[PDB]
Write an enzyme that holds these catalytic residues in place. Structure first.
Site, PDB file in Angstrom:
ATOM      1  N   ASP E  36       0.816  -1.217   0.000  1.00  0.00           N
ATOM      2  CA  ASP E  36       0.000   0.000   0.000  1.00  0.00           C
ATOM      3  C   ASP E  36       0.862   1.286   0.000  1.00  0.00           C
ATOM      4  O   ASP E  36       1.440   1.668   1.022  1.00  0.00           O
ATOM      5  CB  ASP E  36      -0.933  -0.060   1.216  1.00  0.00           C
ATOM      6  CG  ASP E  36      -1.808   1.172   1.374  1.00  0.00           C
ATOM      7  OD1 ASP E  36      -2.270   1.388   2.517  1.00  0.00           O
ATOM      8  OD2 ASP E  36      -2.030   1.918   0.387  1.00  0.00           O
ATOM      9  N   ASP E 218      -2.313   5.295  -5.438  1.00  0.00           N
ATOM     10  CA  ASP E 218      -2.568   4.551  -4.213  1.00  0.00           C
ATOM     11  C   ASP E 218      -2.831   3.082  -4.502  1.00  0.00           C
ATOM     12  O   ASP E 218      -3.952   2.685  -4.786  1.00  0.00           O
ATOM     13  CB  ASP E 218      -3.767   5.157  -3.486  1.00  0.00           C
ATOM     14  CG  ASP E 218      -3.933   4.621  -2.072  1.00  0.00           C
ATOM     15  OD1 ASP E 218      -4.727   5.213  -1.315  1.00  0.00           O
ATOM     16  OD2 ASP E 218      -3.285   3.616  -1.708  1.00  0.00           O
TER      17      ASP E 218
END
Ligand code: 7IG
Lengths: 332, 338, 332, 338, 332, 338
Positions: E36, E218
């Site tokens: 992430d 992201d």
């Protein structure tokens, strides 16, 4: 009149589009077309249709330079938009010299949705753009067809069989696809496949079209349609509500919905819920859509109901040009 | 040449097997048979077939011991098809096809492999090919019928219907001695046989959408009423399927079902006419889901010499084009089916 | 009391209808019936039920003339509407002379939705129309059943197995279909299978039925139901919203929904989200319906919660007439 | 007559195969076997079965060379069932069934067709039919057990459960020497055998919904615990399925799954009682979609003379009606299963 | 810099979650983690995480007592909530001593939805809780990776193949999973994987982000997201409407929706409707959801667009720490 | 020892069959073959295979009569695998594998059962096992290649890719004479063979989630590149599947597809390392519906002595762990595949 008929087998896409093959040119370039009583022109996409339009990247394009029977016209045309042209068109073993539109402008809505390439308009010369003689009139002029009628059969879609999607017969009707005998309703006037409707009843009451209304019998329309206000009232009567784009019922309650009858020429044409709900499912946990939609058709043709594929699936339809009338028979 | 034509009504099983009824013996024993222009022998399963062949448990078996008109022969024979083989022995008896009665030599099959024959709705086969390709040089049934001088023409014709959920739909029809104008429209267009002995013609090209990408320098087409599909060589079909975006599986090619309706036309250039199928003609469109795979009615089949390498035009093609096989003039005619 | 039990195997339709077979007459005419603690009469559709009602075209009809044990009564009855009659009814190898309604008027809503033909009411004589002695009372009177109780097992539906839909046992319970031991809750009063509920909690809080409420244990109801206002508040707590007919959650969020506990007789009866959401799917792209609905049951029985099939699937249920109490046990 | 009853626990595979365990030899070799009133021989696969029979690779094989109580015989035998055939040779050994031990002649099968036996969860078969129908006139197992004088009654009974996702559900149960009142309710109703030698009774009619449209003038019903389905002749089942609106496929009949729940009852008139199945009893209801096809547990099967033409009442029927086979009184009893 | 790369194969769950395996401890205890770029900490659930949390009943728990390389820290941490710890982490054949959070408090929303156990944060130390050195920085410190970059490939989900769900490469990129060459966009500032966006156009017009906006790249976000107001306007432009939780279109009209282009570093990054609508179906009778959602990301990082899995599936992504830039390449 | 390594590109059919190309004869006849560490013989179908074997109609057949380098032998042989058997005779010819040419004895198979071989995309098999297990004591191909002294190491390595919809994905790769560092990362970890002659190692345990519930006291693992799945004994797999909540079917175990993604890890303790697969590694995740059943790539297989009882680590395992088979040091190495 002669002693021939000509049929075209139709593909059924999802019960919403029915189209068959025609050839344009020498040698034939083959196109998928809807046979449409709601319009009067033949048109296909042109090789000169820009790839700007994604519609013209995904459809068969007519290349006039590859046809030796092609004769140029050029007259602009707004059906989609393009120009008039002449060539030989083959429709189920009939060959006819026909003027048609080569469409060079073709927006993504709706004809990106089209699984077909073009339209063969089965309407009258009165509604033809450029007063171009429609194809059926040109075929009538050959004196080969047994009768001056054409007929439509639209099948229900099946995932479990590769059955015929439907059939158009030029010059007659095919008794294999209806039962009993035709009953006819006269056109209000020549120039439009539109008849008087005497009422639309939902189960045990005529709630709609009391005092009469118009019904366009439209082989190019997917659904039965009426005005926004008529359909609002019909759907209210059915217990259906607008999901967001479409009207739905709980799939389990579909089988309990009442019959809808359309009063045409002294006879009642009845669809059961099986005939107008798309039972994509049957659970109490799923919503099912109806094959009836609002469509505000503007003047001069509308306001009017349209009896499209939903209606034709139930009732085999004969368009009678000799007598300016429309015949219905059940099935099958 | 006489004045009779005879028709045989055919059943359509799932668009892949088309068969009609014949009777053999006295009294008649009835069999479901494919009428097959890609072979030249008649056979049915035999009562002498060991029931360890499960296909013989599940099909009608000819019992010579119940036929008074049976004549023994016993010559061994093996019949090799592209999808399987049967073996047995020769017999003679009276065979009825569409009210024509003919004395015929046929194979009593005693070896009948479960794969593929457990998947066959039909019992046996009536080869409509030439004596040149008959195993054991057995005179083919149509030759024996021609010899009677009852048929109006020395031709036979095929109609193969689309599948149907209705019982009242005719699955198909073979006409012996002519053609049925109820099932075609327009005019027949004819292509001469490359050579008598095989129902095979020259093909000038195969185009997929807007590209003659195959058979560019000419090729062969066997017109095969016993074949479910259109077939080509493995190498031709790899290229064909690349162009369609189809994925190869063990026995077939598939596309995602949502992509089926927008696959391009495929055309076969035969004798100065283009014969065009749309995706609805060659996709088994059983869903519109992206999550499901839909099979194509076009397969790879390397047909060995001397007949191949060749394309074969089977039921996928015949469904669209009514086909007349002309023995008098050694030609095949196609007309648009209705 | 005797030493026998009698069971009836039930078909599970979609987790919403559970019904089994009974025979009426000599010889037996066999009907699919729901066994319903929410009513007190036995009724089936009559051979004299008009085909006007499409409900009576699609269901098994009782023909009294074909039964030699049939005795006429005729007294009108509004359960659906018809008349009283007497005959021998066979319920899992028990035969009992029983008065039942022959229904001659049967509207399309709801009983077009019914996969079953009739109802065997397992409620008390107090709620019987015509004060007809209910069937369980008549069977009690024979003195053959081991105990004066009957029990319900409702299975979860499976597409991957042809398992039993459920089971009713007259005269006892079947330990194969529950685990551990029964705990009981006394009826508020005789005449209605209704018990006090001390609270309804959602995960970590009693938000509902603080200060107590009523719970009808209703084998004829598909769902857990409460008042419109109670369910509005429950659903708000769950994060579910009304799609248009029903309450839904994103199918992926179903597994994260909290437990719901019903406080009955000092014990907490807990359903996990698996027990009350119909996970027809599990994707983040699909909506899933809940097996809990609003139902405003009017006086005198309501306002009340109803614990129907949703509850019974989790908790094997014993209806104890000797003691006027209801027993629950887990499963299985 | 003695005082013992013995039960054998059965496994239910997909509502189509019900089998229990027997042990053969010293030490015991265990086999999954169907207990089959429609046949009279015992067989299991043999270690002598060529592993070119793939069904012999996938099943338990009896190895005489590991059994000290084995007695050689070697007589060839072939056993023909409606859905397939096995072949092998006769052997004798000690067989244990539900704690009864009996010296028994059985078939060591050396020829075991992949179709159907690769689809069999069971290894072999224990025929519960009469010696009159035993291939090779081999004394059937139940006869040999009766000869021991341990059984309480000269009867055996069948319970076939519905399928289940739970491991704790009993698939079924055979009781040798009596019946288990835990699995039936009400009273047995009995029908006499047309004749000793076959577990076959008179049937007075078959009705579909509100019409006795079949067997109107009487017919035969074989009560066949080895048959998955109810069957009738092809001609009877065509009519039956017409009435249901069912579509015929190669091996079965289907309806659209949405139509399954509302199909009519079917009743079988046996000995002055009507035996009624609802659609839930004869439809494999695996979905409620109109887009899916659901199979019926009723098939066409032309059972050849002298036993047929006959209906067969198999697992579809027995699931609903607990069945007692009475050898003493040459009758069959039915009671409502629970 | 060294001469090695390390890759981790990722599982694709429903096109919304992409996760791979890491090992923590001696011997390794293996966990499913999302990699992430929107966060900077490594964390997994702890063996000390209460079963109060149903999240911690359904996930792999780290048991520190079973690791001989475990060193205690205890410092509290709010990422989910727990404490800091040190151990050896194995990531595709690279082993690194790393400080990570042992999470002992883990609410049911959202991490009941998680098919993965934990998170490996690929963001900068600037956003690390407890200013813990992120794992990529610790691996950079070993001097073994060929380049100071890491790359992401996210595949489209398939029911018809067991293909790779995706791949992260540490130290480089895998040319098997992109075509052509990378083009890069510089980060606005170090410490956040966020770049300037010069516009968002729908087909034939820049309707959004005229005068510029922010785009967080992201890898932990499922979708392309923008502010509630931006997405409202985008969806209006598309013809999509909010079903109730999500935005949908008629599945048949999905293929006709226009391209959406994101203007990044002088180049246009274009998704066709195939790339942003989940064509779970294609019928005119079904609704289809979009892989674009509103998400109001608060300061200081937002308001901002997020380019998550939807974007990355189209564009293979390289995160370049040496140069503080992000590279995109098509496919494949 | 020489300086050459050779690779063979493999095709991945549905994650269950991985095969590459070899050429046999002069001129070469090409065959699709599985490279199989669980067997030691080479075979391909023979032109002498009766076409009554339908598997011989559907596969490439070796024709000795078209090869000038063929040398007759004729010794009968039968090759028994866990899922089927082939039979034929021995021949010698020149075989090309990855540009290595080697004179090799192989089986010409004349008996090739339709089940399973009609389901095989591959034609034949190249056994990569030891001569100790060679039927007929035929020298295995790798031994014959080692004898040439061209290979850099006396090892060979396997890479098995995940399946793909892309044509540009390599299905897999075998390297003869070394390993390809492009397809693994980290270090090889090695386990010694229990004994030379079998590619089988000691396994110290098998854990399912947080419980070493299996192989608690040690067991065997055959590393079998010819096996599609991980297998264990019936008794071990019953326990394994109980723990997963999986349901047993005829040939496989399934879970409801919605439950697939959250099934626990399974670890295999080999040589002081744990080898862990997640559910995505052993579930054929073909849907997320509760209404569909998803197959597990873990099966029961009772491998008879002397090799078994044993677990087998097949394609399910090798997909995750690149595997090197070391003949020089009689050991197997695993490294994390990429
Ligand atoms: C490569 C030879 C082989 N080696 C080993 N060590 N084990 C096997 N089971 C086989 C072997 C594998 C597949 C087949 N046939 C192919 C097959 C088998 C099956 F069980 C199911 C199928 F669909 C297809 C035959 C033998």
């Amino acid at each position: 009149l002669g002693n021939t008929t000509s049929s075209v087998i139709l593909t059924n896409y999802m019960d919403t589009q029915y189209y068959g093959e025609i050839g344009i040119g020498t040698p034939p370039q083959t196109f998928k077309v809807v046979f449409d009583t709601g319009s009067s022109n033949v048109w296909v996409p042109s090789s000169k249709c820009s790839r700007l339009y994604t519609a013209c990247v995904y459809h068969k394009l007519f290349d006039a330079s590859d046809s030796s029977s092609y004769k140029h016209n050029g007259t602009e045309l707004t059906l989609v938009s393009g120009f008039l042209s002449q060539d030989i068109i083959t429709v189920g073993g009939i060959t006819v010299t026909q003027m048609f539109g080569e469409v060079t402008e073709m927006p993504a809505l709706p004809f990106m949705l089209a699984e077909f390439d073009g339209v063969v308009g089965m309407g009258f010369i009165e509604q033809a753009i450029g007063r171009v003689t429609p194809i059926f009139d040109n075929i009538i002029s050959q004196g080969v067809l047994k009768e001056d009628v054409f007929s439509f059969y639209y099948n229900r879609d099946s995932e479990n069989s590769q059955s015929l999607g439907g059939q158009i017969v030029l010059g007659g009707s095919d008794p294999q696809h209806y039962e009993g005998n035709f009953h006819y309703i006269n056109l209000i006037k020549t120039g439009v496949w539109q008849i008087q409707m005497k009422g639309v009843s939902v189960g045990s009451s005529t709630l709609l079209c009391e005092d009469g209304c118009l019904a366009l019998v439209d082989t190019g329309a997917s659904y039965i349609s009426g005005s926004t206000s008529s359909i609002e009232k019909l759907m209210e009567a059915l217990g259906a509500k607008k999901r967001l784009f479409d009207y739905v019922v709980k799939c389990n309650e579909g089988p309990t919905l009442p019959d809808i009858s359309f009063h045409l020429g002294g006879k009642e044409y009845t669809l059961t819920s099986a005939d107008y709900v798309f039972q994509e499912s049957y659970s109490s946990k799923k919503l099912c859509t109806l094959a009836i939609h609002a469509m505000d058709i503007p003047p001069p043709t509308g306001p009017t109901w349209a009896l499209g594929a939903t209606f034709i699936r139930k009732f085999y339809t004969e368009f009678d040009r000799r007598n300016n009338r429309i015949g219905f028979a059940l099935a099958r």
